[PDB]
Amino acid sequence: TVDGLATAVRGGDRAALPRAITLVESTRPDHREQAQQLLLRLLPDSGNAHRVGITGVPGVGKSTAIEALGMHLIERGHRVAVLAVRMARLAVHPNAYIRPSTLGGVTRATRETVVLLEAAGFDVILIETGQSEVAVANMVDTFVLLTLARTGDQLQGIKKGVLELADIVVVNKADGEHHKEARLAARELSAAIRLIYPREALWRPPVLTMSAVEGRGLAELWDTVERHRQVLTGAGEFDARRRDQQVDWTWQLVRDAVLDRVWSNPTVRKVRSELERRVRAGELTPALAAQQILEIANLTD
């Protein structure tokens, strides 16, 4: 009934999707293996969606923007899924799907859930965010960064480096007392994006203003998301980026499988503090501690 579970998802049965999602989220050894066979069957029905990541600090307005962008999209004929690596009026619609979420684990489960959703007819996948930003950037076509409409304080609370992940930057809460400040805060971020992408010819991250609580700027945000994709498609980079993500994910799964044998080893985990204390104190070289970790892992595996 895995062959059966695949025709039901592809045919649009909507009690079968939660179950296939449950199967994909399971890690019991018997489940991963059928989860794999299902994905394999549904994979050629995937890929026909725009995957958008969305990040920014708690309270920047992420879930308010997603709810509104979700409504905007549904009213335009899309079927929208929201995943997390809050929004009630979205969740009511028969054309929306909202599901709540170890980074390797949740990445795997999210990634595999996307294949299911795309096979199931969803054409827009919104994925909301520790090292979780990179993980989501690596599984989406357009990575969106929401920031604060405060001149000199846009990236408050943002891990450094995250700005370079963004295909689009959005100065949110451009309302109330900060209509004019929003514009200046945006122009400040543009200036910086211009220094970080000084001779980019294909896509330099545009910076938008938004008021996700007043529903202002979501349409323009989406117009920009579509534009990102027409630009990348016209240069052959859109499929090229996806194929490169799937190859990097493959090598990452290989990396995780082979390193978890070590990291996950109980003996390695008891002895870890002491070998580290010794390294930090220069009582032991890192090559020698590394060897000891390996010998020990190898004795108890």
Place this chain on the structure above:
Amino acid sequence: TVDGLATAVRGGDRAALPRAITLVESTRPDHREQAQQLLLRLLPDSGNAHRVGITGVPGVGKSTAIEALGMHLIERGHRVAVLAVRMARLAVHPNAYIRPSTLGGVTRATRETVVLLEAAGFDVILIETGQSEVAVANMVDTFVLLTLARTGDQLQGIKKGVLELADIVVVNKADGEHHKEARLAARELSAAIRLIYPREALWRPPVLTMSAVEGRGLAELWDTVERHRQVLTGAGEFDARRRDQQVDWTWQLVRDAVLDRVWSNPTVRKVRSELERRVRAGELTPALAAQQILEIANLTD
């Protein structure tokens, strides 16, 4: 004579350093092991130096700045080593040491060379730079980024993300027709550093101007390097950063040892293109290709 090779390096014998460096750079299995024992003996004589990384695009002026900074330091009583991951007038001095350089390999060899040099009495280590910037940032106390004194073009050619590695940013070639442009180019970079470190309280990367060919700005660069260190020491972060680098390096060596069994496997390497082509075409899931890579590695090891 490994116990002998350690008292000769620590005592300041200067034909013994090249030889210990040669021993540390060797990967023949019999050599790594004595290299380790030597490092272990010299490790308590290391740590008494300021390690500075230096990066920027080819032609930005790196090796001209290093030669001049080197002379500045030697005339002030330091013993200076330069490593690379060009400068002849430096290389003549009995208080300078210049040595030319697989990323894991060259990182290991550089890192181990630093211990030797510090044991040998060198108190300033300059390390000049693919993913080589992160590697050097992870092995130094102060990471310096040289950029161009061109308004709107400072980071031309720089991999994105590298700006967030810098403890210090230096607008170089602030001479000739660009004295005033240099000042503005610097103020542009300050504005961006201010957006990326909007509420930093301990150390916000200062941005300096320099003319490394006219010997202008090197002294101020070094004053800033020393200041970086007094600031970090006053907060207990200077040793804390070093100890965290040695622990991360340990886990990296463990990661490299365990993954090279796979990556380095000849059979894995023949079959790689085809498994990738299959992943990129959606003929195969990444979890299933990952498994096939592992089974195959495991059959031929």
